[PDB]
Design a binder for this molecule. Structure first.
Ligand SMILES: NC(=O)C1=CN([C@@H]2O[C@H](COP(=O)(O)OP(=O)(O)OC[C@H]3O[C@@H](n4cnc5c(N)ncnc54)[C@H](OP(=O)(O)O)[C@@H]3O)[C@@H](O)[C@H]2O)C=CC1
Ligand SMILES: COc1cc(C(C)(C)C#Cc2c(C)nc(N)nc2N)cc(OC)c1OC
Length: 192
């Protein structure tokens, strides 16, 4: 796969864009999790799949029984990994481009975490889309948070809902979804 168009997918708490605390997620938003599954899994052309790419720490955060994430090609990046195809669902590499050089029959490519990987790849020109779940809370400062996005969104344009709807197909997009004290919306951004 040569020069794939790549999408970042992430859920972040406004306005600071916090995404984690002590190696874990600061919320459990069940509908958001299902959205993540549906969007990363679904394909538009028959007999293909998507790839999901992540840093080693993010991979290790998934319970070992629930990785690899089913129905998607999982790619894990470490600075200690040489290129290795582990099995049909798992690749080890040290860059996204090299990891996908090894790959055919993949439609979409998603970056699924974590902060370090996000904050590098936001400035990689292969990344053409951001799928950001913007989470809001009445008192965001009260949520324990130590990992943050550093996204220069001035160089990006938030697209209308119609563009997001097109991207996700017939996936149902509900507005202002509320779980506990959190309220969230699905968004799509492209390069300005
Ligand atoms: N809210 C959300 O939507 C999401 C939040 N998260 C959160 O993010 C946090 C994890 O993020 P973070 O701790 O930054 O870790 P990452 O998941 O981003 O992994 C970092 C590791 O990836 C490898 N790596 C980083 N850059 C490169 C590179 N350029 N080339 C090759 N390998 C590289 C290194 O592995 P090595 O050390 O082996 O060399 C590094 O230690 C957790 O708290 C998690 O819950 C994660 C996903 C989504
Ligand atoms: C697939 O579910 C998980 C996803 C994840 C990761 C970190 C890969 C994620 C994510 C993610 C979500 C939930 N939403 C959005 N919008 N983007 C993401 N990258 C970690 C998990 O355990 C900690 C999970 O439970 C098994």
């Amino acid at each position: 796969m040569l020069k794939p168009n790549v999408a970042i997918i992430v859920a972040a708490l406004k306005p600071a864009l916090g995404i984690g605390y002590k190696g874990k997620m600061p919320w459990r938003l069940r509908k958001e999790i299902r959205y993540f599954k549906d969007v990363t899994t679904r394909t538009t052309k028959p007999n293909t799949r998507n790839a999901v790419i992540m840093g080693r720490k993010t991979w290790e955060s998934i319970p070992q029984k629930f990785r690899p994430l089913p129905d998607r090609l999982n790619i894990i990046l470490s600075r200690s990994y040489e290129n290795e195809i582990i099995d049909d669902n798992i690749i080890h590499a040290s860059s996204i481009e090299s990891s996908l050089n090894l790959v055919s029959d993949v439609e979409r490519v998603f970056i699924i975490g974590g902060a370090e990987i996000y904050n590098e790849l936001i400035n990689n020109s292969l990344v053409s889309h951001l799928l950001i779940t913007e989470i809001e809370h009445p008192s965001p400062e009260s949520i324990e948070m130590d990992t943050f996005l550093k996204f220069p969104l001035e160089s990006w344009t938030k697209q209308p809902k119609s563009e997001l709807q097109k991207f996700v197909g017939d996936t149902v997009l509900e507005d202002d979804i509320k779980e506990g004290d959190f309220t969230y919306n699905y968004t799509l951004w492209t390069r300005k």
